[PDB]
Amino acid sequence: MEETRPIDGLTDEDIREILTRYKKIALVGASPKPERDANIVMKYLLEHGYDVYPVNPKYEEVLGRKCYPSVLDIPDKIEVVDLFVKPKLTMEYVEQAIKKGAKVVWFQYNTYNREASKKADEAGLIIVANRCMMREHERLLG
């Protein structure tokens, strides 16, 4: 009998390696609204040593961090693109992630897009799908 395994096929060690090594995060869909999940996860990641660049062309600053209108506008290397936007918006952000030389595209709950995941894979990025960075951090490293 096999148990529910994650759709992205990554082991707990694979996720642990990502969470340990890749800490330059572009958090797409960042929001200053305390009720938004993007706000909660951004606050958590900042508390745990992540360098979190908010990405949302609507805002100039989120949680005291300069907020950028695209992943490509960030003046630093970016390792993980952490997605908090609706599925169809993720295609453009994956294209930006590829151009930026990011290593990991991370689909948070309710953001998964098959075509975007396809592009990431073909470009050699790691895909994390239907997981939360905060929940995975709490579970594996907390």
Ligand X SMILES: CC(C)(COP(=O)(O)OP(=O)(O)OC[C@H]1O[C@@H](n2cnc3c(N)ncnc32)[C@H](O)[C@@H]1OP(=O)(O)O)[C@@H](O)C(=O)NCCC(=O)NCCS
Pairing status of strand 61-62 against strand 65-66: antiparallel
Q: What are the strands of the beta sheet with 24-28, ordered from one edge?
A: 51-55, 24-28, 80-83, 104-107, 126-129
Nearer to Cl ion, 1 or 111 (CB): 111
Choice from 37, 51, 73, 95 touching Ca ion (CB under 5 A): 95
Task: Answer yes or no: are the C-beta atoms of 5 and 31 closer than 8 Å.
Answer: no
Choice from 29, 117, 125, 136 touching Cl ion (CB under 5 A): 117
Sorted by sequence, the CB contacts under 8 Å of residue 56 that are 6+ apart come out as: 28, 29, 30, 31, 62, 67, 69
Closest contact distance (angstroms) between CB of 70 and Ca ion is: 11
Is 2 marked as binding a ligand?
Answer: no
Closest contact distance (angstroms) between CB of 97 and Ca ion is: 11
What, of Cl ion, ligand X, Ca ion, none, does residue 26 touch, CB below 5 to 8 Å by kind? none
What, of Cl ion, ligand X, Ca ion, none, does residue 108 touch, CB below 5 to 8 Å by kind? ligand X
What, of Ca ion, ligand X, Cl ion, none, does residue 56 touch, CB below 5 to 8 Å by kind? ligand X
Task: Answer yes or no: are the C-beta atoms of 75 and 19 closer than 8 Å.
Answer: no
CA pair distance 133, 44, nearest whole angstrom: 9
Closest contact distance (angstroms) between CB of 113 and ligand X is: 11
Site residues, Cl ion (CB under 5 A):
32, 117, 129
